Amino acid sequence: LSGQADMIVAPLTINNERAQYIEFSKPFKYQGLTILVKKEIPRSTLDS
Amino acid sequence: VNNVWNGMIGEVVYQRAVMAVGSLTINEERSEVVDFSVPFVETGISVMVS
């Protein structure tokens, strides 16, 4: 919304609030959210 | 066919009925003629094999 503007290209996201001011294009990707957690350390190795 | 649209796209383009709510897939030629809104269901070409 300033002099820089131009044709911003980045992993943006299509949102209602964002779209109320600027206008997007047809998406070039599709994604969800997919909560991420650290992998559990497997302690079951029949050591004992 | 021969630049004579038919179907839902034809009905929309001939000023007979606005809006085409249904199972319509976004393409390039259609978007060149009759503009779409933002997609609400993602889809594509896929194959079943039994």
Swiss-Prot record, chain A:
<feature type="binding site">
    <location>
        <position position="11"/>
    </location>
    <ligand>
        <name>glycine</name>
    </ligand>
</feature>
<feature type="binding site">
    <location>
        <position position="13"/>
    </location>
    <ligand>
        <name>glycine</name>
    </ligand>
</feature>
<comment type="function">
    <text>Component of N-methyl-D-aspartate (NMDA) receptors (NMDARs) that function as heterotetrameric, ligand-gated cation channels with high calcium permeability and voltage-dependent block by Mg(2+). NMDARs participate in synaptic plasticity for learning and memory formation by contributing to the long-term potentiation (LTP). Channel activation requires binding of the neurotransmitter L-glutamate to the GluN2 subunit, glycine or D-serine binding to the GluN1 subunit, plus membrane depolarization to eliminate channel inhibition by Mg(2+).</text>
</comment>
<protein>
    <recommendedName>
        <fullName>Glutamate receptor ionotropic, NMDA 1</fullName>
    </recommendedName>
</protein>
<comment type="similarity">
    <text>Belongs to the glutamate-gated ion channel (TC 1.A.10.1) family. NR1/GRIN1 subfamily.</text>
</comment>
<feature type="binding site">
    <location>
        <position position="18"/>
    </location>
    <ligand>
        <name>glycine</name>
    </ligand>
</feature>
<comment type="subunit">
    <text>Heterotetramer; the NMDAR subunits are modular and harbor tiered domains that function in concert to regulate opening and closing of the cation-selective ion channel pore. Forms heterotetrameric channels composed of two GluN1/zeta subunits (GRIN1), and two identical GluN2/epsilon subunits (GRIN2A, GRIN2B, GRIN2C or GRIN2D) or GluN3 subunits (GRIN3A or GRIN3B) (in vitro). Can also form heterotetrameric channels that contain at least two GluN1 subunits and at least two different GluN2 subunits (or a combination of one GluN2 and one GluN3 subunits) (in vitro).</text>
</comment>
UniProtKB/Swiss-Prot annotation, chain B:
<protein>
    <recommendedName>
        <fullName>Glutamate receptor ionotropic, NMDA 2A</fullName>
    </recommendedName>
</protein>
<feature type="binding site">
    <location>
        <position position="25"/>
    </location>
    <ligand>
        <name>L-glutamate</name>
    </ligand>
</feature>
<comment type="subunit">
    <text>Heterotetramer. Forms heterotetrameric channels composed of two GluN1/zeta subunits (GRIN1), and two identical GluN2/epsilon subunits (GRIN2A, GRIN2B, GRIN2C or GRIN2D) or GluN3 subunits (GRIN3A or GRIN3B) (in vitro). Can also form heterotetrameric channels that contain at least two GluN1 subunits and at least two different GluN2 subunits (or a combination of one GluN2 and one GluN3 subunits) (in vitro). In vivo, the subunit composition may depend on the expression levels of the different subunits. Found in a complex with GRIN1, GRIN3A and PPP2CB. Found in a complex with GRIN1 and GRIN3B.</text>
</comment>
<feature type="binding site">
    <location>
        <position position="23"/>
    </location>
    <ligand>
        <name>L-glutamate</name>
    </ligand>
</feature>
<comment type="similarity">
    <text>Belongs to the glutamate-gated ion channel (TC 1.A.10.1) family. NR2A/GRIN2A subfamily.</text>
</comment>
<feature type="binding site">
    <location>
        <position position="30"/>
    </location>
    <ligand>
        <name>L-glutamate</name>
    </ligand>
</feature>
<comment type="function">
    <text>Component of N-methyl-D-aspartate (NMDA) receptors (NMDARs) that function as heterotetrameric, ligand-gated cation channels with high calcium permeability and voltage-dependent block by Mg(2+). NMDARs participate in synaptic plasticity for learning and memory formation by contributing to the slow phase of excitatory postsynaptic current, long-term synaptic potentiation, and learning.</text>
</comment>
